[PDB]
Amino acid sequence: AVGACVLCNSQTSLRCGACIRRPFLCCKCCYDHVISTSHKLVLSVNPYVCNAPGCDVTDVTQLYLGGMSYYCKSHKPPISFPLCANGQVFGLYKVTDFNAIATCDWTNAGDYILANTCTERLKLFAAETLKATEETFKLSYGIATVREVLSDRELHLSWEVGKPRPPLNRNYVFTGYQIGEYTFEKDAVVYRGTTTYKLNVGDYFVLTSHTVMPLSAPTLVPQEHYVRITGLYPTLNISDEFSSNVANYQKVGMQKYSTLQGPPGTGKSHFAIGLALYYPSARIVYTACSHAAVDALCEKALKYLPIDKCSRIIPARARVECFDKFKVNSTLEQYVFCTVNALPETTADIVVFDEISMATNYDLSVVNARLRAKHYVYIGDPAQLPAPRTLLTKGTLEPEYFNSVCRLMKTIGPDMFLGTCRRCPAEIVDTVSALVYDNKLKAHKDKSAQCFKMFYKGVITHDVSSAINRPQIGVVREFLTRNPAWRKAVFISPYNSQNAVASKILGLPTQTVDSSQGSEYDYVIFTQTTETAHSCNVNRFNVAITRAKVGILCIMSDRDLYDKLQFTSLEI
Ligand SMILES: [Zn+2]
Ligand SMILES: [Zn+2]
Ligand SMILES: [Zn+2]
């Protein structure tokens, strides 16, 4: 019961018993917390509760020290001192932002703004409190039980009465009962078991509620600037392919950490792998939140780096299939590719943390705690999508609040910016450059004259709250009959239910905007589906149209984003 104050470090025996994370608070800080919030339970070796038999006074502001014990006003001896006096709470070794983080329910955007604008120690308290709240919320959902199994990919479910039903998308991962992790897609539902198992009737599924470990490391280590490249030894013979990044690679070696904003198709993986070639003896750990981001770095490394010095770290509790071409779980290979949640405790010359817009402060801290490195390079784009905030329902989370790295990129600017999009036709580049990049993103490709837009509101139906627009899919079907090259297009929309309908009617492969992030396709067909905050989000819109290498068709619901698209308009 002895520790350091989460607000000012001052040693104490006090912890707030009303806070879900029970943070250590020093006398001057514990007082400022109890006296300004509904939190009145204070914990020491023994709690601050009335020692008198049968008394239920637990409020610290109504308690006094009667010798060596604690008593309320009704039970205190004549010679007693109040626990709360002269701006402090009695304890050994004798905040407006801390109060809001400690008492908020994480359903408002302002709660996330505070968690990213507060002091460093309060960023860890906020990240731990938020993650713990997100887990206890998983318990609120009802259990799903198998009523009947139709096929190897379809079943019928029986839900728990009195408890709400979680959304049925790829985002919500269930645990079968331990028959492996399972996902569902919309009376027949589509099941996807991570482990192939003959679904038994009576078996049940629950969302995996995991224990939130405490955070110790900052989201960002303190910044250091050096006069020379430190702890890294550059090649003199550097491949022409990577010459464009030489100044940026030198910047990387002359700072403790560096941020790289890379818009779509500007060379983020190329930059990341080129760093290994520029500092050929450096041990580099490549990390990201998702298996897909880690695998994309592996694919790029497979092409430029010696395969024998690479290793893909995979947790024994395998959830999805991932990269197979490197030796698995060899922590000491020069190049280690691993998701944040699976990181071993190791050191490195450089840590490259990719797809930074998807990281949370919880992830930023975990990386600093598991990896001790000479240099940290954060790669991503605050104009792309953040990690879903399951509890957030009110307000929009702006990019400067996604995490500490995105906050830096949006306030002081990134240390490095990849300014030339090599993927997209110029119509797409020009649109997103003006939309989210302050006209700093340049097109490498010419206009393809295969980027089309159509303003068609159609009809919005809903599968619970996930939206469908059949008339927008009908417009796509008509377009496909006249444009056979587009037969190979990937269908993209902001909604899983829109994608499920489009899959049956069009037969095109399907992706939500969020799942398409990091991927590229020659042709993309996008149906906005609705005019909601979700489907109009500029970061989601940016990701949606930058998936295309050759052509894109956008069937739009929103006049604003439609008018912004620098595409050829189609009639009907
Ligand atoms: Zn303090
Ligand atoms: Zn508290
Ligand atoms: Zn009492």
Give me 315's structure tokens. 């947790």
* Ligand 2 mean position, distance from CA 23 (Å): 8
Distance between CA 27 and CA 84 in Å, rounded?
9
Question: Cα(539)–Cα(135) distance, rounded to whole angstroms?
Answer: 27
Distance 30 CA to ligand 1 centre (A): 7
Residue positions in the annotated binding site for a ribonucleoside 5'-triphosphate?
262-269
442 Rama sector, left if φ>0, alpha if ψ -120 to 50, beta otherwise: beta
Answer whether 544's CB lies under 8 Å from 508's CB: no
Q: Which ligand is nearest to the CA of 21?
A: 2
Q: How far apart are CA 231 and CA 245, in angstroms?
A: 19
C-alpha to C-alpha distance for 21 and 103, rounded to whole angstroms: 11
DSSP code for 254: T
- Ligand 3 centroid–CA 414 distance in Å is 58
Query: With breaks defined as C to next N over 2.5 Å, after which residues does the chain break?
Result: 94, 177, 186
Ligand with minimal distance to 5 CA:
1
Dist. CA 185–CA 364, nearest whole Å: 31
Domain CATH number, residue 527: 3.40.50.300
Determination technique for this PDB entry? X-ray
Residues 543 and 414: beta-carbon distance below 8 Å: no
Find the 40 Cα to ligand 3 centroid distance in Å.
15
3-state helix, strand, coil in the chain (%, to 5): 30, 25, 45
Q: Which domain holds residue 450?
A: 421-564
What is the CA 493 to chain-centroid distance, rounded? Answer: 20
Count helices and strands (H / E) in the chain. 16, 33
Closest ligand, as measured to the CA of 53: 3
Annotated binding site for Zn(2+): 5, 8, 16, 19, 26, 29, 33, 39, 50, 55, 72, 75
- Ligand in nearest proximity to the CA of 77: 3
What backbone torsions phi and psi does residue 28 show, to the nearest 5 degrees? -65, -30
Q: Please state the residue numbers annotated as binding site.
A: 5, 8, 16, 19, 26, 29, 33, 39, 50, 55, 72, 75, 262-269
What separation in angstroms does the CA of 132 have from each of 113, 126, 147, 210, 253? 18, 10, 32, 9, 37
Q: Where are the alpha helices (DSSP H) in 398-469?
A: 404-411, 426-436
Provide the residues around ligand 2 (an ion) whose CB is within 5 A.
16, 18-19, 39, 102
In three-state secondary structure terms, 302 is: helix
Report how far ligand 2's centroid is from the alpha carbon of 19 (Å).
Answer: 4
Among all bound ligands, the one having the nearest atom to the CA of 29 is: 1
Closest ligand to Cα 17: 2
CA–CA gap between residue 312 and residue 412 (Å, rounded):
34
**DSSP one-letter code for 372:** E
As a whole number of angstroms, the distance between CA 562 and CA 572 comes to 15
Residues lying with their CB under 5 A of ligand 1, a single-atom ion: 5, 7-8, 10, 26, 29
Single-letter code of the amino acid located at 310: C
Cβ neighbours of residue 266 closer than 8 Å, sequence gap 6 or more: 418, 419, 420, 421, 422, 441
Give the C-alpha separation, 466 to 462, whole Å.
6
CA angle 99, 101, 103 (to 5 degrees): 65
HSE-up of residue 109 (Cα within 13 Å, Cβ side): 9
542: number of Cβ within 10 Å: 23
Question: What stretches of 437-469 show up as alpha helix (H) in DSSP?
Answer: none
Considering just the CA atoms, what is the radius of gyration of the chain in Å? 27
Closest CA to 453 of 570, 547, 543: 570
Residues flanking ion ligand 3, Cβ below 5 Å: 50, 52, 55, 57, 72, 75
